Design a binder for this molecule. Structure first.
Ligand SMILES: CN(C)c1cccc2c(S(=O)(=O)NCCCCCCN[C@H]3[C@H](O)[C@@H](O)[C@@H](O)[C@H]3CO)cccc12
Ligand code: NA
Ligand code: NA
Ligand code: NA
Ligand code: NA
Length: 535
């Protein structure tokens, strides 16, 4: 069985699993489900969701509760139960940092500050965040991580585990960096040549080179070097893909480092992280912004020639489900809503106020569009041209409903324009619209709540794979046609069996007169367009 691998070529990416591109249609447990007794409350949600991959913590405190005394009993049960359900796993190594803090480090780590030191603020107070310059802390984390990877090397030959997250939301809240004597000695000293070279900057100390950014860039660099060393040590045992997940700063209006988690892979320090940690496969955003513009900005910033897009976490409230479409449209390798278990917890206001079957169903509905073509989509995303869009107005607020005669008419025109998206597919364009009948051309009014989206993959110059949700998709020529006319040549609904297209029916007549109209039900279409002479 070939190792999973992240491939990067011509600014595109694939997560290879069993020798072909793979899409993580993911779900992540709540933070306290990493025990055998809790798995009963995880699997039903995962089945209801139709997820193909489970993200779940493996805690340093549980594998090494007494120094040198390893316990992999949780990993044994998890591997067995995952294999029984024919799903894959992403293990989340909760160790030196989990949300900036050492709460998941063993008692013998997190209660020994002298051996395993904390960030010291400028004012001399201590924060509950382990310093990335703690050399004992790095050696201990690395040692335990190596034992976890040795367990997988010996006990996971078919790679049930496809990827490992190293730490969880690293950084520091309440200070920009470590100002300890140990840290100041490194801050005051030369910026390492390797960083100075990769960023093409003039040599000097951190303050000289980075000015107003020296504190933040220094924390980012030391944490990236720490995480890179743990990653290299684990890969030397078994070379799985490994990644870090970011406690995002607001990309538009971030405020100050330490209000957000300073030193994590935030948008302003991706250049430091990529320079400092070449062994970490990707930097994954954890998305809890609900509003379309900010989520779209995060997807743009984290999709780079040097960075595969993996939405390692997203809120589990209804508005987040539609972001699967732009994630995959950007060539994303996966998408993993957070808190998908029945362990009596909700992270509202980040996620759903209520966790029930309806919560899960909002993600199940969009996964049902991708599951039937997962391997074909993954190959097209890597090897070719894909597109994906989500409904670009958020649900109307109570404010807007009350606080909104000729204006009503104007407001409806502005919303209809905003709810109309253009995609350039080469010789053909698609126009995607949201919240309108399946017949005639009444302008779009949006879904209540906002929920729609569309996926398109190019099969050939004039042929597209299309699936969409609570939306209309219409094709037109991309360029003026010089006397020719155009039509849909053929729309087929079907599926892939053993990688071969099987037609179920032809969409025609009402079904293609008014664009291609999708509801909540899955339909996978092959759309062939034609220009023709009327000479
Ligand atoms: S805005 O409103 O979107 N601002 C939200 C900022 C806080 C996000 C923190 C997100 N932390 C995440 C961790 O990685 C997981 O282990 C959990 O703890 C998860 C939060 O349930
Ligand atoms: Na891709
Ligand atoms: Na074009
Ligand atoms: Na064009
Ligand atoms: Na079908």
């Amino acid at each position: 069985a070939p190792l999973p691998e992240l491939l990067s070529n011509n600014g595109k990416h694939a997560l290879m699993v069993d020798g072909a591109p793979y899409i993580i249609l993911g779900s992540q447990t709540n933070n306290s489900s990493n025990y055998p007794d809790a798995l009963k409350d995880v699997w039903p949600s995962m089945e209801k969701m139709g997820a193909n991959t489970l993200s779940i913590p493996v805690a340093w405190e549980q594998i090494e509760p007494v120094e040198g005394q390893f316990d992999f009993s949780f990993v044994d049960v998890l591997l067995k139960e995952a294999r029984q359900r024919k799903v894959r796993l992403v293990l989340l190594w909760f160790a030196t940092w989990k949300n900036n803090a050492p709460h998941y480090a063993p008692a013998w780590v997190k209660l020994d500050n002298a051996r395993f030191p904390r960030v010291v603020k400028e004012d001399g107070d201590t924060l509950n965040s382990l310093s990335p310059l703690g050399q004992n802390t790095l050696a201990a984390d690395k040692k335990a991580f190596v034992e976890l990877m040795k367990y997988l090397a010996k006990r996971d030959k078919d790679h049930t585990v496809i990827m490992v997250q190293v730490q969880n939301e690293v950084g520091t809240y309440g200070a920009v960096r470590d100002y300890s004597p140990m840290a100041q000695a490194v801050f005051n000293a030369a910026v390492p040549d390797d960083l100075i070279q990769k960023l093409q900057l003039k040599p000097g100390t951190w303050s000289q080179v980075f000015g107003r950014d020296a504190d933040e860039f220094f924390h980012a660099y030391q944490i990236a070097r720490y995480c890179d060393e743990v990653t290299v040590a684990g890969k030397a045992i078994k070379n799985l893909p490994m990644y870090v997940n970011v406690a995002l700063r607001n990309p538009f209006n971030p405020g100050l480092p330490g209000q957000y988690s300073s030193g994590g892979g935030t948008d302003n320090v991706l250049h430091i992280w990529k320079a400092a940690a070449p062994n970490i496969d990707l930097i994954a955003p954890d998305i809890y912004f609900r509003d379309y513009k900010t989520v779209s900005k995060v997807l743009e910033l984290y999709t780079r020639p040097d960075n595969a897009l993996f939405v390692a976490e997203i809120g589990n409230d209804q508005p987040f489900a539609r972001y699967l479409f732009p994630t995959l449209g950007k060539g994303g390798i996966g998408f993993s809503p957070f808190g998908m278990d029945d362990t009596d917890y909700t992270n509202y206001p980040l996620g759903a106020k209520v966790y029930n079957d309806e919560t899960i169903e909002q993600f199940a509905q969009v996964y049902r569009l991708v599951n039937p073509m997962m391997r074909e989509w993954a190959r097209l995303s890597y090897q070719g041209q894909v597109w994906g869009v989500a409904e670009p107005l958020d649900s109307t607020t109570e404010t807007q409903k009350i606080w909104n005669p000729e204006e009503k008419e104007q407001h409806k025109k502005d919303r209809a324009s905003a709810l109309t998206q253009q995609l350039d597919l080469g010789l053909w364009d698609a126009e995607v619209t949201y919240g309108r009948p399946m017949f005639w051309v009444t302008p779009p009014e949006g879904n209540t709540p906002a929920a729609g989206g569309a996926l398109i993959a190019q099969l050939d110059d004039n042929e597209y794979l299309v699936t969409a949700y609570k939306a209309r998709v219409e094709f037109k020529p991309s360029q003026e046609l010089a006397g020719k006319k155009f039509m849909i040549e053929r729309v087929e609904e079907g599926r892939f069996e053993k990688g071969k297209w099987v037609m179920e029916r032809v969409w025609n007549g009402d079904q293609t007169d008014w664009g291609l109209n999708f509801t909540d039900r899955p339909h996978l279409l092959r759309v062939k367009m034609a220009s023709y002479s009327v000479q």
